[PDB]
């Protein structure tokens, strides 16, 4: 009588068909950018996939078609899922914009996302060659 929602499987984090191509920029994204964002005071709501049921967001996956979270990004970096830094940056962008899409501009969670995004853009300015 009250819809409670339901969760998808989490996004894929490995691509076994792809060669292991390590780069300085991807190393930096894992060891500096991701780690720095992870430890920020506002990071915790973004560290794992949204649980629409336990968070009482029963329409979350109706609205958000491409979910993304920092735990998924961390695994993708660890597993060498990304071909380049741009792909990883795109996933951070998807994570922040999903928050802006689902929520209202004045919401606390949006202030948190904006702060993380500003820090992320600062850290991406410091990427290696
Ligand atoms: C980032 C994924 N995400 C959402 O988009 C979202 C919307 C509404 C609540 C919520 C939550 S939540 O844990 O239910 N509420 C987040 C609040 C919890 C209270 N706050 C703090 C700093 O202690 C502000 C952030 C987690 C992750 C979410 C959301």
Swiss-Prot record:
Role played: Chromatin reader protein that recognizes and binds acetylated histones and plays a key role in transmission of epigenetic memory across cell divisions and transcription regulation. Remains associated with acetylated chromatin throughout the entire cell cycle and provides epigenetic memory for postmitotic G1 gene transcription by preserving acetylated chromatin status and maintaining high-order chromatin structure. During interphase, plays a key role in regulating the transcription of signal-inducible genes by associating with the P-TEFb complex and recruiting it to promoters.
Organism superkingdom: Eukaryota
Free-text note on domains in this protein's UniProt record: The NET domain mediates interaction with a number of chromatin proteins involved in transcription regulation (NSD3, JMJD6, CHD4, GLTSCR1 and ATAD5). The C-terminal (CTD) region mediates interaction and recruitment of CDK9 and CCNT1 subunits of the P-TEFb complex. It is also required for maintenance of higher-order chromatin structure.
Residue span relative to the full protein: 44 to 166 of 1362
Site (Acetylated histone binding): 103
Protein's organism: Homo sapiens
PTM remark: Phosphorylation by CK2 disrupt the intramolecular binding between the bromo domain 2 and the NPS region and promotes binding between the NPS and the BID regions, leading to activate the protein and promote binding to acetylated histones. In absence of phosphorylation, BRD4 does not localize to p53/TP53 target gene promoters, phosphorylation promoting recruitment to p53/TP53 target promoters.
More details: JQ1, a thieno-triazolo-1,4-diazepine derivative, and I-BET, a benzodiazepine derivative, have been tested on tumors with success. Treatment with GSK1210151A (I-BET151, a I-BET derivative) has strong effets on mixed lineage leukemia and promotes myeloid differentiation and leukemia stem-cell depletion.
Protein encoded by which gene: BRD4
Lineage: Eukaryota, Metazoa, Chordata, Craniata, Vertebrata
Disorder this protein is connected to according to its UniProt record: Cornelia de Lange syndrome 6: A form of Cornelia de Lange syndrome, a clinically heterogeneous developmental disorder associated with malformations affecting multiple systems. It is characterized by facial dysmorphisms, abnormal hands and feet, growth delay, cognitive retardation, hirsutism, gastroesophageal dysfunction and cardiac, ophthalmologic and genitourinary anomalies. CDLS6 inheritance is autosomal dominant.
Protein name: Bromodomain-containing protein 4
Position(s), cross-link Glycyl lysine isopeptide (Lys-Gly) (interchain with G-Cter in SUMO2): 62
Similarity section: Belongs to the BET family.
Localisation: Nucleus; Chromosome
Subunit structure: Interacts with p53/TP53; the interaction is direct. Interacts (via CTD region) with CDK9 and CCNT1, acting as an associated component of P-TEFb complex. Interacts with RELA (when acetylated at 'Lys-310'). Interacts (via NET domain) with NSD3, CHD4, BICRA and ATAD5. The interaction with BICRA bridges BRD4 to the GBAF complex. Interacts (via NET domain) with JMJD6 (via JmjC and N-terminal domains); the interaction is stronger in presence of ssRNA and recruits JMJD6 on distal enhancers. Interacts with NSD3. Interacts with NIPBL.
Tissue specificity annotation: Ubiquitously expressed.
Domain Bromo: 21-127
Effect the entry attributes to changing residue 103 to A: Abolishes binding to acetylated histones
